[PDB]
Amino acid sequence: VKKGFRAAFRFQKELERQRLLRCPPPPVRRSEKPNWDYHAEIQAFGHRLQENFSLDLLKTAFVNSCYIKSEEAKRQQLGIEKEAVLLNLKSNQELSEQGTSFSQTCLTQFLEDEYPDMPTEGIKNLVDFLTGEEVVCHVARNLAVEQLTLSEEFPVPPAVLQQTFFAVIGALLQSSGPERTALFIRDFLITQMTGKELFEMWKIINPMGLLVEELKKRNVSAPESRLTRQSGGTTALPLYFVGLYCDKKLIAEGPGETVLVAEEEAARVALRKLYGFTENRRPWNYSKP
Amino acid sequence: GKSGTWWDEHLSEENVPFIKQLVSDEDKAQLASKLCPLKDEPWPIHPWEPGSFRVGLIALKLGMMPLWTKDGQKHVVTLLQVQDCHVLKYTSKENCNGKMATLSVGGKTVSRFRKATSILEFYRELGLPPKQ
Amino acid sequence: ISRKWEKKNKIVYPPQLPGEPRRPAEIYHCRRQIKYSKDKMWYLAKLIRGMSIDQALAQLEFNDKKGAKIIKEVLLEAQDMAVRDHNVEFRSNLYIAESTSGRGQCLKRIRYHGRGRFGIMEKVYCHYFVKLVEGPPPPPEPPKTAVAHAKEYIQQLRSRTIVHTL
Amino acid sequence: AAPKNRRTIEVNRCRRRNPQKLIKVKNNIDVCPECGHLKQKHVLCAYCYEKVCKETAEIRRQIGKQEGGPFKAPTIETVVLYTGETPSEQDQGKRIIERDRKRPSWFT
Amino acid sequence: ISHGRVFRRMGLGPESRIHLLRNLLTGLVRHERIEAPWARVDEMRGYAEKLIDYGKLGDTNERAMRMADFWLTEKDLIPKLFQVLAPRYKDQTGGYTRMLQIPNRSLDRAKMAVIEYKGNCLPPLPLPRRDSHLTLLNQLLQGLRQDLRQSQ
Amino acid sequence: TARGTPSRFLASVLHNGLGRYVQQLQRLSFSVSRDGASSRGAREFVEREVIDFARRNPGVVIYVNSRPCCVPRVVAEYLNGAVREESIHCKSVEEISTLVQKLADQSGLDVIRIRKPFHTDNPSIQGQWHPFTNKPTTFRGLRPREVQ
Amino acid sequence: TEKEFMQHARKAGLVIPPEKSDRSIHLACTAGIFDAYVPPEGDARISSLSK
Amino acid sequence: ASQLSPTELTEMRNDLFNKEKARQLSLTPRTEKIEVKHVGKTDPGTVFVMNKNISTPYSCAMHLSEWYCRKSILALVDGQPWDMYKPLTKSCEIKFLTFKDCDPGEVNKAYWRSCAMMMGCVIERAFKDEYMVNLVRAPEVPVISGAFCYDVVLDSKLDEWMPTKENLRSFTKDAHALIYKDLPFETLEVEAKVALEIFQHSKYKVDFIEEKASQNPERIVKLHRIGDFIDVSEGPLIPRTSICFQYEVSAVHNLQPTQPSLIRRFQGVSLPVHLRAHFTIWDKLLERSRKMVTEDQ
Ligand SMILES: [Mg+2]
Ligand SMILES: [Zn+2]
């Protein structure tokens, strides 16, 4: 044997490293790891967002009905009466309803006075994207409300995560006026629109029909599509350029690999140019009025 | 998957001489059908120009033999036998090299049971037994 | 010495839910200390690799090697263990998923070369491993056709970006 | 002649795993019409050949029992007979070898 | 370069090859069925057919007597050859020495085979049977043969 | 070496500078030994500076575990979920204060090769270059050597 | 270059304590049952309280 | 009898088929054990233990080896041919048949019934939807005759044309597409009432169901299914449709004056994978099939 202690200990820690790396464990809630205290985490979540929450309404926002039912089932399978605190848990349903209603109406007001030319269906699809499950799940996971969420199924399936996120939006709506909550939903939802093209959120199907309906609304008669530039018609990697001429006047230009895809892309470009949502548009004026 | 197979694997004992006799009479009748080419529909016969090239044959080396000339010397000859020779297909001038047309010529007859599929389809559209 | 292949038959999975797939059977088996080289055994273990068990037994009953009879006996006892103990009901419903060979413990001898010199002859020994999975044998992966190659090339031409700026 | 550098495992794997050295799958194998013991085409089934070789060894054992020692080699044809099975009127001058068994249902 | 070169080289010379074929032929005449490797039984079949021809030549002929005295090394098989085998093949000309492969030898994995004289009071070999007449392809060809013979 | 290590692109975690800036650190887990010469600097730090650091930025939570250990450590968990653990074994008060300030400053993204240090998300304004930019059109789109 | 294998063992226990010793095995059961209770043929027919 | 799209008819036919199959499968409550025995030639004394009304004879072959799964086409349940995908009923004895057996005539009749059903499947889905096709029957022609037959009446607009070689080439390509999908001949023993309730429209098929239901005392008919195709046939079939390798429909013939409207006899020829022929023998057998085969009396 080689006598000594430090090398064997260091190799034992390295063996535990590789052994935990080969078989990773099922991940556990952060509230069940050793370094945890709920009240201080609530206070720090209130203070780090530069907001003044009332802590009782945040505690109201972070409970869920599934957590209440599982806690009551756990208290009944053991037979211990918890009718002292559990009858005043007061789940986050009404705060989530207030949050989703206020965030919907304020985001539609933002996107309406920001864009005077957008139709109601388009702004409806935009507010349905921004308040949809995916991006609020992203913002909720990167703003640590998932660590503060009290529920079952530790990955926190994104519907109840959306429930808690709009619940804390409603808690800010209760604790402070519409200006503060408007600034909050601006700073944490309108910034999610950055760098994304419009039809990456709306996802329309037939753009040319939408364009001819829009031009029938503006009393300009009919967009006829002329081929403008092409390079390679017989090869397997073509390039076309289709321009949409309304009354001998260009409105757009779209490239593509075939004439159908390039004409459809020119229809998308014309639709973005008409709706006032281009890459050349004014970036959002993040400031204080 | 698929096993290998040949023409007389699954025939019975009675059917093999009938099959051999049938295909032998069939391709002998096929070889005897093309015996009169000038009365069928021959291509137009042209006279000899000074710069022309005719087709050749395909023969079979039988053996060798001596042969004497009138002045007394001895020469040795090789007996080439043309068993069954038939022009097969005609490729025009613009389809091979753009310089000279080609003519395909087939050799001695072989069995249908030992050739490929595309060769059998080619000779079936032509109407001859396959060549070696 | 390490015997870990034999312990793989003593794994027990939790009982399945009704709304789940079948989770087909897995049977591990091996025979230790075979008087045979490991490379010549490896050629038979590569011959078997993907085929069904009956086709494997057919290809081994007519293969003229010393390892062929040994692998045929191992496959027969593995098939019998699969039918009896490991709850496989159809005997022909097995394919080889893993089959390989490892070097076993060896001995050493002299060679007595043609002067007062010598070499070190090694009496080689090897193992054989096999793993059977119930179900039909999975089909071989077909060679990728021209449209797949054109799709991959067009996708690579799609995925390029403006490099070394912004 | 000597090696100048040691061959790697990549060159060795490129040598000893190419399709010229691998064992080729054969497809000549089918089942025998009697007893189904996995014969090959163009080759007699090993089980049926073992049957007829065992019975031929038994008949040669009885023949060697009838012929005393070496160098007898009788000048008449032979027939074998099983239990029952009286000598037919064509088998008069032929030598009789009867072992003791039923006539099996492939030897006619 | 062995263009047109029959008689593969077997033993340690020509004489040992002919002695090996002589011993195999003596074993064939004695036991009426023999298992031996494939090239050896091929050569021994080729010799055994003309040995049966010399037996068919007759007993009183001294040349056939000399050939049978050379090729049979047990000297009791010569009355057998002239009085059993050659009267048995009086109608046939050359259809005998039926040769079939048997799978492999156990030890050195050599290609084995079995030849036998016809007649042969031993139990029969499991011969490869041609496919039956009642199968699908044969019945279709039988219909074609009958239809063409009716058409002729 | 860069080929032997992974890499990421430069990015903010959740678009900090556009709206409001948020402190990207959540927790600071101090384990200080009661007795032990290895943790004297952390001992003096917990005596004199951690209270002023906790009052300096109220977004972070600080835990002082006060556990018998031969190597004192500080565990920092960030907002996006990363965990960075560094040791304070045998350091002064100034080096420990500089370490915890540098932990409080940075965001939880991995310290790897930064790979093109600018992240414009709309890089073009006048229109990105395509080969038909700076190429004039001709009458009725006729290609070279065309007849009509 | 003169070495062979080791570990010749067997996998069948035997009756070694009666090969000889002065300690006998203290059992805690018996072989089978003494005399089998034969049930009545119609116990399912007599499944009630009595008959 | 009503107005019907051609798709919703085979939709309701397959849904009635699956309903009858679910009824037959739910008829038995549990898994009852039957002791099927093997009195074949190769493995004597073998006895399987099977599930009643569940286990096919393919599932009895799958205990033995793979060669029984590949080369057994038609089974023998105590006196009678059973197709390989029909669930057993009683405790019986079984024995398998192959193509290369001594007396394979039963499996030859079953194979030509299978090929006639495949020709019906390929013929009902290639015609114009404005035109009407009605499957009459499959005449059981003996196998010595040059081709198998299927009879189909056409629309009254179609009484004047005859198809060229290209239409028959399209028929053969669709038949090879049907062979390319490895589909099972799924069979069913259905009472004649619900059997005619499945069809209900094609009067020739109703007359055929009443014909084959007339001879047996229990009014039990034999239905089979290839994917979403449904047809009536007498007796058993081959297990898989990939057993066919060479397949080709020869020609059509008109046999008019027996009836005022027109019946057309489609003819074709096939051979399995296990007995495939060389190209010359195959074109000979194909050439004989162009002649008219008449065996109905
Ligand atoms: Mg030699
Ligand atoms: Zn056999």
Short mmCIF file of N, CA and C in Angstrom, two decimals, chain A residues 99-198:
data_model
loop_
_atom_site.label_atom_id
_atom_site.label_comp_id
_atom_site.label_asym_id
_atom_site.label_seq_id
_atom_site.Cartn_x
_atom_site.Cartn_y
_atom_site.Cartn_z
N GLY A 99 -54.91 39.07 -13.61
CA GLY A 99 -53.66 39.24 -14.34
C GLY A 99 -53.79 39.00 -15.83
N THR A 100 -54.49 37.93 -16.23
CA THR A 100 -54.59 37.64 -17.66
C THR A 100 -55.49 38.66 -18.35
N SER A 101 -56.55 39.13 -17.67
CA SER A 101 -57.41 40.15 -18.27
C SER A 101 -56.69 41.48 -18.42
N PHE A 102 -55.95 41.90 -17.38
CA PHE A 102 -55.26 43.18 -17.45
C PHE A 102 -54.09 43.14 -18.43
N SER A 103 -53.34 42.03 -18.44
CA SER A 103 -52.22 41.91 -19.36
C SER A 103 -52.71 41.86 -20.80
N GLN A 104 -53.84 41.19 -21.05
CA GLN A 104 -54.41 41.18 -22.39
C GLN A 104 -54.82 42.57 -22.84
N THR A 105 -55.56 43.31 -21.99
CA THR A 105 -56.05 44.61 -22.44
C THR A 105 -54.92 45.62 -22.56
N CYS A 106 -53.88 45.50 -21.72
CA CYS A 106 -52.81 46.48 -21.77
C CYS A 106 -51.84 46.18 -22.91
N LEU A 107 -51.60 44.89 -23.20
CA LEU A 107 -50.79 44.56 -24.37
C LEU A 107 -51.50 44.91 -25.67
N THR A 108 -52.83 44.75 -25.72
CA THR A 108 -53.54 45.20 -26.91
C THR A 108 -53.53 46.71 -27.03
N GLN A 109 -53.53 47.44 -25.91
CA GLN A 109 -53.42 48.89 -26.00
C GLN A 109 -52.04 49.32 -26.47
N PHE A 110 -50.99 48.66 -25.95
CA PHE A 110 -49.61 48.92 -26.38
C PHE A 110 -49.43 48.65 -27.87
N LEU A 111 -49.84 47.47 -28.33
CA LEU A 111 -49.63 47.13 -29.72
C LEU A 111 -50.61 47.86 -30.64
N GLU A 112 -51.70 48.41 -30.09
CA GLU A 112 -52.61 49.20 -30.91
C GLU A 112 -52.08 50.61 -31.13
N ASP A 113 -51.68 51.30 -30.06
CA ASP A 113 -51.17 52.65 -30.30
C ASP A 113 -49.73 52.66 -30.80
N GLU A 114 -49.03 51.52 -30.74
CA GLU A 114 -47.74 51.42 -31.40
C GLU A 114 -47.89 51.21 -32.90
N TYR A 115 -48.92 50.47 -33.32
CA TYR A 115 -49.12 50.10 -34.72
C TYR A 115 -50.54 50.46 -35.13
N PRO A 116 -50.73 51.60 -35.80
CA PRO A 116 -52.08 51.99 -36.22
C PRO A 116 -52.63 51.20 -37.39
N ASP A 117 -51.79 50.47 -38.12
CA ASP A 117 -52.23 49.80 -39.34
C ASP A 117 -52.50 48.32 -39.16
N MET A 118 -52.17 47.75 -38.01
CA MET A 118 -52.36 46.33 -37.76
C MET A 118 -53.85 46.00 -37.63
N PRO A 119 -54.35 44.97 -38.30
CA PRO A 119 -55.75 44.57 -38.11
C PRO A 119 -55.95 43.93 -36.75
N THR A 120 -57.22 43.78 -36.37
CA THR A 120 -57.55 43.25 -35.05
C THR A 120 -57.19 41.78 -34.92
N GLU A 121 -57.27 41.03 -36.01
CA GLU A 121 -56.87 39.62 -35.98
C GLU A 121 -55.37 39.49 -35.75
N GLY A 122 -54.58 40.39 -36.34
CA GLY A 122 -53.13 40.32 -36.19
C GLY A 122 -52.67 40.68 -34.79
N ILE A 123 -53.25 41.74 -34.21
CA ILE A 123 -52.90 42.11 -32.85
C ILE A 123 -53.44 41.08 -31.86
N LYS A 124 -54.54 40.39 -32.22
CA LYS A 124 -55.04 39.30 -31.40
C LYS A 124 -54.08 38.12 -31.41
N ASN A 125 -53.53 37.78 -32.59
CA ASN A 125 -52.53 36.72 -32.66
C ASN A 125 -51.24 37.11 -31.95
N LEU A 126 -50.88 38.40 -31.98
CA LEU A 126 -49.66 38.83 -31.30
C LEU A 126 -49.81 38.77 -29.79
N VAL A 127 -50.95 39.21 -29.25
CA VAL A 127 -51.15 39.14 -27.81
C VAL A 127 -51.38 37.70 -27.37
N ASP A 128 -51.89 36.84 -28.27
CA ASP A 128 -51.99 35.43 -27.93
C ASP A 128 -50.64 34.74 -27.97
N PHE A 129 -49.70 35.26 -28.76
CA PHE A 129 -48.34 34.73 -28.73
C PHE A 129 -47.61 35.16 -27.46
N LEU A 130 -47.70 36.45 -27.12
CA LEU A 130 -46.92 36.96 -25.99
C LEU A 130 -47.47 36.47 -24.66
N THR A 131 -48.79 36.30 -24.55
CA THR A 131 -49.34 35.67 -23.36
C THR A 131 -49.52 34.17 -23.51
N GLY A 132 -49.00 33.57 -24.58
CA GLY A 132 -49.07 32.13 -24.76
C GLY A 132 -48.21 31.36 -23.79
N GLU A 133 -48.24 30.03 -23.88
CA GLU A 133 -47.62 29.18 -22.87
C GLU A 133 -46.10 29.23 -22.92
N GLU A 134 -45.53 29.28 -24.13
CA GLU A 134 -44.10 29.08 -24.31
C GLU A 134 -43.28 30.22 -23.73
N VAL A 135 -43.59 31.46 -24.14
CA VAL A 135 -42.71 32.56 -23.77
C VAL A 135 -42.95 32.98 -22.32
N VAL A 136 -44.16 32.79 -21.78
CA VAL A 136 -44.34 33.08 -20.37
C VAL A 136 -43.74 31.96 -19.53
N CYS A 137 -43.64 30.75 -20.08
CA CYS A 137 -42.91 29.69 -19.37
C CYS A 137 -41.42 30.00 -19.35
N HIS A 138 -40.90 30.59 -20.43
CA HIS A 138 -39.50 31.00 -20.48
C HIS A 138 -39.20 32.11 -19.48
N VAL A 139 -40.03 33.16 -19.48
CA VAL A 139 -39.85 34.29 -18.57
C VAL A 139 -40.05 33.85 -17.12
N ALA A 140 -41.00 32.93 -16.89
CA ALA A 140 -41.26 32.43 -15.56
C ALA A 140 -40.11 31.57 -15.04
N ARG A 141 -39.49 30.79 -15.93
CA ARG A 141 -38.37 29.97 -15.50
C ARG A 141 -37.13 30.82 -15.25
N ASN A 142 -36.93 31.87 -16.04
CA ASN A 142 -35.77 32.72 -15.84
C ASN A 142 -36.02 33.90 -14.90
N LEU A 143 -37.19 33.97 -14.27
CA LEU A 143 -37.42 34.93 -13.20
C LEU A 143 -37.68 34.26 -11.85
N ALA A 144 -37.38 32.96 -11.74
CA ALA A 144 -37.35 32.17 -10.52
C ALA A 144 -38.70 32.02 -9.83
N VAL A 145 -39.82 32.19 -10.54
CA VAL A 145 -41.10 31.91 -9.89
C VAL A 145 -41.38 30.42 -9.87
N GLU A 146 -40.67 29.64 -10.70
CA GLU A 146 -40.81 28.19 -10.64
C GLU A 146 -40.21 27.63 -9.36
N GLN A 147 -39.17 28.28 -8.83
CA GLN A 147 -38.62 27.86 -7.56
C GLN A 147 -39.55 28.22 -6.41
N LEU A 148 -40.33 29.28 -6.57
CA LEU A 148 -41.27 29.74 -5.56
C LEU A 148 -42.66 29.16 -5.76
N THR A 149 -42.87 28.35 -6.80
CA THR A 149 -44.18 27.78 -7.05
C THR A 149 -44.41 26.58 -6.14
N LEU A 150 -45.57 26.54 -5.50
CA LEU A 150 -45.97 25.43 -4.65
C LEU A 150 -47.02 24.62 -5.40
N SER A 151 -46.65 23.42 -5.81
CA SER A 151 -47.51 22.55 -6.60
C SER A 151 -46.95 21.14 -6.54
N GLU A 152 -47.53 20.25 -7.33
CA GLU A 152 -47.01 18.91 -7.54
C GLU A 152 -46.35 18.83 -8.91
N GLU A 153 -45.71 17.68 -9.17
CA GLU A 153 -45.02 17.38 -10.42
C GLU A 153 -43.94 18.43 -10.72
N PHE A 154 -42.84 18.33 -9.94
CA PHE A 154 -41.66 19.21 -9.85
C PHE A 154 -41.22 19.89 -11.15
N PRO A 155 -41.27 19.26 -12.34
CA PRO A 155 -41.10 20.05 -13.58
C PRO A 155 -42.11 21.19 -13.78
N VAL A 156 -43.21 21.24 -13.03
CA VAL A 156 -44.25 22.28 -13.05
C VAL A 156 -44.78 22.45 -14.46
N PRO A 157 -45.70 21.58 -14.89
CA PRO A 157 -46.25 21.62 -16.27
C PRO A 157 -46.77 22.99 -16.64
N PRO A 158 -46.49 23.46 -17.86
CA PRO A 158 -46.44 24.91 -18.12
C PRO A 158 -47.77 25.64 -18.02
N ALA A 159 -48.90 24.93 -17.97
CA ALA A 159 -50.18 25.58 -17.74
C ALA A 159 -50.25 26.18 -16.34
N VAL A 160 -49.82 25.42 -15.33
CA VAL A 160 -49.87 25.94 -13.96
C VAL A 160 -48.75 26.95 -13.73
N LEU A 161 -47.65 26.85 -14.49
CA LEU A 161 -46.63 27.89 -14.44
C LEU A 161 -47.15 29.20 -15.01
N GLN A 162 -47.90 29.12 -16.11
CA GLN A 162 -48.57 30.29 -16.67
C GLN A 162 -49.59 30.85 -15.69
N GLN A 163 -50.28 29.96 -14.97
CA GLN A 163 -51.24 30.34 -13.94
C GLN A 163 -50.56 31.17 -12.85
N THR A 164 -49.42 30.69 -12.34
CA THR A 164 -48.71 31.43 -11.30
C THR A 164 -48.08 32.72 -11.81
N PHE A 165 -47.63 32.75 -13.07
CA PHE A 165 -47.03 33.98 -13.58
C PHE A 165 -48.07 35.07 -13.76
N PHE A 166 -49.23 34.73 -14.32
CA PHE A 166 -50.29 35.73 -14.39
C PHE A 166 -50.89 36.02 -13.02
N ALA A 167 -50.75 35.10 -12.06
CA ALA A 167 -51.16 35.37 -10.69
C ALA A 167 -50.28 36.44 -10.05
N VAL A 168 -48.97 36.38 -10.27
CA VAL A 168 -48.13 37.42 -9.66
C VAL A 168 -48.26 38.73 -10.43
N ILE A 169 -48.62 38.68 -11.73
CA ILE A 169 -48.98 39.90 -12.44
C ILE A 169 -50.23 40.53 -11.82
N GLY A 170 -51.22 39.70 -11.50
CA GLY A 170 -52.41 40.21 -10.82
C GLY A 170 -52.13 40.69 -9.40
N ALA A 171 -51.15 40.09 -8.73
CA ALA A 171 -50.75 40.56 -7.41
C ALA A 171 -50.09 41.93 -7.50
N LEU A 172 -49.31 42.17 -8.55
CA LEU A 172 -48.78 43.51 -8.78
C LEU A 172 -49.89 44.49 -9.16
N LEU A 173 -50.92 44.01 -9.86
CA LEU A 173 -52.07 44.85 -10.19
C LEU A 173 -52.86 45.23 -8.95
N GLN A 174 -52.93 44.33 -7.97
CA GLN A 174 -53.61 44.65 -6.72
C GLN A 174 -52.76 45.58 -5.86
N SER A 175 -51.46 45.29 -5.74
CA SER A 175 -50.61 46.03 -4.81
C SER A 175 -50.20 47.40 -5.34
N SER A 176 -50.21 47.61 -6.65
CA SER A 176 -49.83 48.89 -7.22
C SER A 176 -50.72 49.19 -8.42
N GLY A 177 -50.68 50.44 -8.87
CA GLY A 177 -51.58 50.91 -9.90
C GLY A 177 -51.33 50.32 -11.28
N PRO A 178 -52.13 50.74 -12.26
CA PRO A 178 -51.96 50.21 -13.62
C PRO A 178 -50.71 50.69 -14.31
N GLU A 179 -50.13 51.81 -13.86
CA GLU A 179 -48.89 52.29 -14.45
C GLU A 179 -47.72 51.37 -14.12
N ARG A 180 -47.62 50.95 -12.86
CA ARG A 180 -46.53 50.09 -12.43
C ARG A 180 -46.62 48.71 -13.07
N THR A 181 -47.82 48.13 -13.09
CA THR A 181 -48.01 46.83 -13.73
C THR A 181 -47.84 46.93 -15.24
N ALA A 182 -48.19 48.09 -15.82
CA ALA A 182 -47.96 48.30 -17.25
C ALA A 182 -46.47 48.35 -17.56
N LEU A 183 -45.70 49.03 -16.71
CA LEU A 183 -44.24 49.05 -16.87
C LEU A 183 -43.65 47.66 -16.70
N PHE A 184 -44.21 46.88 -15.78
CA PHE A 184 -43.72 45.52 -15.56
C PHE A 184 -43.97 44.63 -16.77
N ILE A 185 -45.20 44.66 -17.30
CA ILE A 185 -45.50 43.77 -18.42
C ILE A 185 -44.82 44.27 -19.69
N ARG A 186 -44.56 45.57 -19.80
CA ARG A 186 -43.69 46.07 -20.86
C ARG A 186 -42.30 45.47 -20.76
N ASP A 187 -41.65 45.67 -19.60
CA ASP A 187 -40.26 45.27 -19.40
C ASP A 187 -40.05 43.77 -19.47
N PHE A 188 -41.09 42.97 -19.23
CA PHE A 188 -40.91 41.53 -19.23
C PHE A 188 -41.76 40.79 -20.26
N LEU A 189 -42.48 41.48 -21.13
CA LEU A 189 -43.13 40.78 -22.23
C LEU A 189 -42.89 41.43 -23.59
N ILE A 190 -42.83 42.77 -23.65
CA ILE A 190 -42.63 43.44 -24.92
C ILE A 190 -41.20 43.23 -25.40
N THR A 191 -40.26 43.08 -24.46
CA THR A 191 -38.88 42.78 -24.79
C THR A 191 -38.71 41.39 -25.40
N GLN A 192 -39.69 40.50 -25.22
CA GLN A 192 -39.64 39.19 -25.85
C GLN A 192 -39.93 39.24 -27.34
N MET A 193 -40.47 40.35 -27.84
CA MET A 193 -40.73 40.53 -29.26
C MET A 193 -39.50 40.91 -30.07
N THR A 194 -38.36 41.10 -29.42
CA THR A 194 -37.20 41.66 -30.09
C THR A 194 -36.55 40.65 -31.02
N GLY A 195 -36.21 41.10 -32.22
CA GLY A 195 -35.50 40.29 -33.18
C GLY A 195 -36.35 39.27 -33.92
N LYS A 196 -37.66 39.26 -33.72
CA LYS A 196 -38.53 38.29 -34.36
C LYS A 196 -39.35 38.96 -35.46
N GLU A 197 -39.41 38.29 -36.61
CA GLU A 197 -40.27 38.71 -37.71
C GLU A 197 -41.73 38.45 -37.34
N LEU A 198 -42.63 39.23 -37.95
CA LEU A 198 -44.04 39.24 -37.57
C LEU A 198 -44.71 37.90 -37.83
#
